[PDB]
Amino acid sequence: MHIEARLFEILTAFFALAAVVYAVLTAMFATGGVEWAGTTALVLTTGLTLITGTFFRFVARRLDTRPEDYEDAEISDGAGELGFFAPHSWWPILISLSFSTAAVGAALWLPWLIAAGVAFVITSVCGLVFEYYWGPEKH
Amino acid sequence: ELEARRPFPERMGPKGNLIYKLITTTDHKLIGIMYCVVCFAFFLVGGLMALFMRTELAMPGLQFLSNEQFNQLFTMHGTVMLLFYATPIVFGFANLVLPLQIGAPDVAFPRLNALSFWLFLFGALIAIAGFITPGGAADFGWTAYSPLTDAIHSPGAGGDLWIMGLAVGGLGTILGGVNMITTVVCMRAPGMTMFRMPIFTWNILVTSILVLIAFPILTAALFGLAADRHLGAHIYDPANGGVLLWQHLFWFFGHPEVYIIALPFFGIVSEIFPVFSRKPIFGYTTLIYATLAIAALSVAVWAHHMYATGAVLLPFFSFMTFLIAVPTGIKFFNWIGTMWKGQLTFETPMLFSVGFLITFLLGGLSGVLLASPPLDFHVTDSYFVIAHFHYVLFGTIVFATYAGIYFWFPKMTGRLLDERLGKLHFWLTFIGFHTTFLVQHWLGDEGMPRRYADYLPTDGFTTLNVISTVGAFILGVSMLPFVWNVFKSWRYGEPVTVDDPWGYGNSLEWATSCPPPRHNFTELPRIRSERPAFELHYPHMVERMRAEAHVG
Amino acid sequence: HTGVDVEDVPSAEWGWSHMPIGVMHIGGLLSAAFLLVMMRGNHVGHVEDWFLIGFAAVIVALVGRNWWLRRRGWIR
Amino acid sequence: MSTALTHGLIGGVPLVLFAVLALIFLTRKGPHPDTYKMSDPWTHAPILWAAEEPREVVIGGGASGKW
Amino acid sequence: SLNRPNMVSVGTIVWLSSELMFFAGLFAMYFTARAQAGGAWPPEPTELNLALAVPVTLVLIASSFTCQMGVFAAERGDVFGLRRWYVITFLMGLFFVLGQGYEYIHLVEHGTTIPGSAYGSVFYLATGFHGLHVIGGLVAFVLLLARTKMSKFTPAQATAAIVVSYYWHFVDIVWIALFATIYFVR
Amino acid sequence: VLGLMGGLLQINPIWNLGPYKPSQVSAGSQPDFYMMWTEGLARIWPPWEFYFWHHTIPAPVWVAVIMGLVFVLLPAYPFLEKRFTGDYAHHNLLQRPRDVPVRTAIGAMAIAFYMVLTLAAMNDIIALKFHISLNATTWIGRIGMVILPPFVYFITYRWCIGLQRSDRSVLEHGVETGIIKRLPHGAYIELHQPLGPVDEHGHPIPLQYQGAPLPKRMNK
Amino acid sequence: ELDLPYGSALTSSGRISAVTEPGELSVHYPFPTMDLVVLDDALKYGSRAAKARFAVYIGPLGADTAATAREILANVPTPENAVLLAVSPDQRAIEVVYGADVKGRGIESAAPLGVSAAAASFKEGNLIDGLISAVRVMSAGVSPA
Ligand code: HEA
Ligand code: HEA
Ligand SMILES: CCc1nc2ccc(Cl)cn2c1C(=O)NCc1ccc(N2CCC(c3ccc(OC(F)(F)F)cc3)CC2)cc1
Ligand SMILES: [Cu+2]
């Protein structure tokens, strides 16, 4: 993919420019020197876009043309078998209930509720991860 | 040859057809419907709070409310209306019509979708359930300023629920953004490159990037605040730089938030205009570049909300907001150009889009007026600011959302909403809105600051409050035609037995059966431009679309 | 069994799957009457009777809508 | 300002405006075709309506009558 | 069809970027309130024992190489090498977090607390969240090993192993940054 | 398990209390969880007494008759059901709870009633730990006692029928595998897997329901 | 190689993709909606209680009327187990056709009843109303088998 990488490179360039400009303009002309709270956010949003753009760049350099990236193409090119898309599942609502229990146990300071919520989150996430890998029962 | 049909399609459906499919679903269409319904319920709740506020603000004197109850009212109104109605409605429209527009069978991660929806719902319910506490809900502002939300001040048990509900909702939103980015990048039709996809999809991609940048820092700030409230963590004391630290963090979050809830509705209206103008979208790549520019600039202006503290570098942020004012102008001009010299027909989506245009123009004018420091030195923290952001918020979310509903109701249901009720609804909304929020500019220019529960009769401005509350009640009554229309037209109402009930459609979603099948597609057309359905239904038009595409 | 149709309840011959509608209607009416009479012995307050009357009115409205729609043939 | 008239406006203006707008808009003609009356001829295309109920050319009988 | 650029990889990458922004917020909390306390800004009752902060950093750095060897053995279809390397990684990550807990105990024993100081607050809140992320990574390791145990090895298992691996690499390098900021710059 | 939780968890520490004296009292006065419904019923029942000639009928009489009515309605249920449904045959095969929607809804309603009565017994603990008013909890219980059972009945009925429909769908078609194809003329199908024989054109012939559970995941 | 009247287009499958201008419908039935609904639940619930598709035809029969009616009956999905009711408001003619599979179930004792009810209701100018009455009586007559 060539255009996504270019988008992220544009964003990273602008963010780095803005971060450096803000840092050096608040080093002077400011009440107490460098501002130290917007500077950090700016360098690390630069780092975010940089990470994403670099990953996309490597994947693009390690890839041959794709029917999506390619113009000139027809629908007989993508004829094949896509991945695995999960049909019906009921684990998400249980995960959300467990996380909400832990959150309300953290709002009102109740340690037992926090412990129960964490245990339920571990259980529900385990159920979600193993859903399509449990084998038949051994009897 | 004759061919058998039914006298009328089935109204409701069998018994037991929905409740179990609602819990274990993974398809994006049902999840988008659920999004929309619950977000409108929360909209009604917030509006009720606003009506209580108005009916108290008329008639000087505390007639039936208190000071605490008024503070809780405006806090919860702001919180609900911004975080439990707009941010999820964005993902509602996304889940509805993004995979259809890119030609995909499903979203990238189908269970993360349902996880996001349920996280949103339960976080909202947690945050709202502070009213059953005897002390009440959160009583600080929507913004939760620096030492007022401490443990000494604001000691109740509503602030805790506020914080935790916001944290859960933010987690849900981050997951939704991840899913949308991955879906737009990977799953895509075998013919369309990224410079052929519709503008709605591009706006959604950019908004998801902004979400990923913005929300984690809010979760960090909220965890710091909860640590400070439950452990005495000396993080935000004014003794340290604790008063300005919170403001910097919060506003670095909070401006990207308003742009997040602004961009996709620009997309919606830019997608409705060409269908009813019978023309192409004016300046495709120009609109894409304007969107990218607004996105890049939205994160480096966060401090134009902190002029009156006397602790920021004013020229930097003032100049850069003046700068961000430009791409919105080019976007506006491209819309007006797309409407220029076409064949206009004003059905309800077009009508709501024109209303959006007018209201957003006035709001943006007031905002760019607000962006200069020596003027914000007077009009900040007054009702001028309230009028401004109510213009922009209303004109964007409310009008573009009603437009999107009236536009995509057939593509998700197979029925048609009534049009006389739609026109009545639009005119009621327009009149009530412009009569409830127009006088507040004058009301705030002369001294009347925001967040007051009472005032004295010796002061002025007692007639303007009466006009504003009359307008608020008109706006409140304007919602009955819409819910009646939706309640009747979902079961009865003229069925749609064709594709593209609004002729001259685009965007590859008007090339599949009106209620789309599971997996959304039974065949795809050959993709050569950004109007594939138009070239599919009118094949005698490609020569004329390629010949005269550059006159201008 | 007394009788429902299989296209409504697929497993209609495997177990009890029908309860008469008069039972539900008159039960709703009786529960509304109970909610209404539960405010006898007014113990220094009226925040509670607002809720009582609201819930009773909602129940009566639901029962009335169902009865009226069944009487005119809009349901079965 | 004269509490009675404040309440009066707040309670009366919205409903009055609703009334005028409803009488303006809700009394027009919808896009539905107006009913067919059997005194006049039948010009619509032929109509065949099935039942669809039971999921999945020798005649057995017949009858007639001409009104 | 299958559009070779993997999907789980893109998802994990974008989520890792968001988590980086979370840690950005924490860092911004730390840097302010350090420009306020003048002079010996670590108050006198605190002394950072360096003789124990270096070993745990080195065991984490070595665990990175162990995880990389595991994913190497994963990309070719044999599970037992994956299991051995990931068990090693789990063990030494557990050792790291145990050492961190020991330092917390010995530090609160005669000095800093969360409600006692501002430096104590920023220090504990900057290191405890990283500890929580490490614990989440350990739980992920356990779940992945069990899933490899319960059925046949296919490419999906390899993808899961890869994404868990470089999530762990992310947590490792962000710890490197935290450590170099807290202990050496001061 | 009993030894472990009798060694590690503490129950009834009588020494923290004192000997019984008719003049002193404490704040948590609950019985063990199998009498909490009796206590809750006594808490949320309104004060209705009758005073006639030279006599008095107090309020707890109501608790007495309601308790007795419950204890009489429990053992006499099979005869009620056989009188109402009119089925008197021998049965040795069990029913799945989803095949009998009305009885499942009745049972869910009774369980909801029991849960409301049990939670109405820990009013003090709930109102103290979770910051809620005490009068609020009393009225919440008093109203839930009437509006929660029917709501639960409705939802349980609809849920049972939904489960039945989900079973019939996998009987008619095959088991969904979750794999998607693109079918060179741009169509998406989902590759079901049949449970029995197939017809000439590849579609499976529908089976008949036999009261037994059906698989839903391909890995089972 | 057909005309495809200005908006229709044949896709890669056999499906037709039609469109409509913003201000029209796609049914054009000269009857009210609240009578179409009634005719529909009649046609459905009477077909449940009889195990036989019921159909209704309204176009012209400009030939030997019974011939044309049995010509039309071959368009129901399972014509052999089906009951059709044809009506031509210009020729003022009623025709009821059966299938071979639906017979011996009390049908010819009910067809003249339905025809007479439909005629008696048509003699005032109620088309949908007489159709409803006839479908009701014929569905109540036929027995399941
Ligand atoms: C959903 C949206 C939303 C949008 C889009 C905006 C858009 C803008 N906002 Fe607004 N704003 C809010 C929501 C929004 N705002 C909220 C909620 C608050 C305060 C909340 C709180 O404090 O509690 C707020 C507060 C706020 C403030 C500070 C108020 C304070 O003092 O407290 C300022 C100025 O600094 C500001 C400026 C702007 C500017 C410059 C734009 C620009 O984006 C708009 C530019 C738009 C145009 C329409 C220009 C039209 C273009 C052409 C026609 C070319 C014209 C050219 C010239 C005149 C040069 N906003
Ligand atoms: C996206 C957002 C959004 C929307 C839609 C609104 C909508 C409205 N707002 Fe709000 N508002 C804010 C965002 C929004 N607001 C923010 C951010 C603030 C300031 C925050 C703060 O200071 O902290 C604010 C503050 C604010 C104030 C001043 C508070 C203060 O004093 O400072 C006022 C009133 O003057 C007001 C009025 C209104 C009115 C009249 C509407 C009308 O649009 C709404 C009309 C709505 C309805 C009436 C709903 C209809 C309801 C019924 C039909 C009742 C039915 C009930 C049931 C079925 C439950 N808003
Ligand atoms: C209100 C309950 C309660 N409040 C509190 C408060 C604090 C604490 Cl710590 C505990 N509680 C409890 C409590 O412990 N409840 C359990 C309980 C309830 C009732 C009965 N009664 C026994 C026999 C009677 C009886 C006897 C003869 C009869 O024969 C006749 F007359 F012919 F019918 C009928 C009934 C009724 C039930 C025992 C235990
Ligand atoms: Cu300000």
Author numbering:
A (entry chain H): 1 to 139
B (entry chain F): 10 to 561
C (entry chain D): 25 to 100
D (entry chain I): 1 to 56, 69 to 79
E (entry chain G): 18 to 203
F (entry chain N): 276 to 495
G (entry chain J): 13 to 157
What does the paper say about this structure?
In OXPHOS, the protein complexes of the electron transport chain (ETC) establish a proton motive force (PMF) across a biomembrane that drives the synthesis of adenosine triphosphate (ATP) by ATP synthase. The reliance on the PMF and ATP homeostasis thus highlights the importance of the mycobacterial proton-pumping cytochrome bcc-aa3 supercomplex, which consists of a bcc menaquinol reductase (complex III, CIII) and an aa3 oxidase (complex IV, CIV) that are tightly associated. M. tuberculosis cytochrome bcc forms a dimeric assembly with endogenous menaquinone/menaquinol bound at the quinone/quinol-binding pockets. MK/MKH2 are part of the Q-cycle hypothesis and essential for electron transfer in the cytochrome bcc complex.
We observe that close to the Qp-binding pocket within the membrane of each QcrB of cytochrome bcc there is density for Q203. All of the Q203 molecules fill each QcrB subunit binding deeply into the QP pocket and with identical binding modes. In addition, the carbon atoms of Q203 make hydrophobic interactions with QcrBGly175, QcrBAla179, QcrBLeu180, QcrBThr184, QcrBSer304, QcrBPro306, QcrBMet310, QcrBAla317, and QcrBMet342. Continuous density is observed between the head of Q203, a likely bridging water molecule, and the side chain of QcrBTyr164. After addition of Q203, the turnover number of the hybrid supercomplex reduces to 5.8 ± 2.4 e-s–1 from 23.3 ± 2.4 e-s–1 (mean ± SD, n = 4). The binding of Q203 involves residues from both QcrA and QcrB. Consistently, the mapping of reported mutations in Q203-resistant M. tuberculosis reveals that they are positioned directly where Q203 binds in this structure. The structure of apo cytochrome bcc is almost identical with the Q203-bound structure (rmsd of 0.50 Å for all Ca atoms), which suggests that Q203 binding does not significantly affect the overall architecture of cytochrome bcc. A comparison of the Q203-bound and Q203-free cytochrome bcc structures shows residues involved in the binding pocket move outward, thus adapting to the shape of Q203.
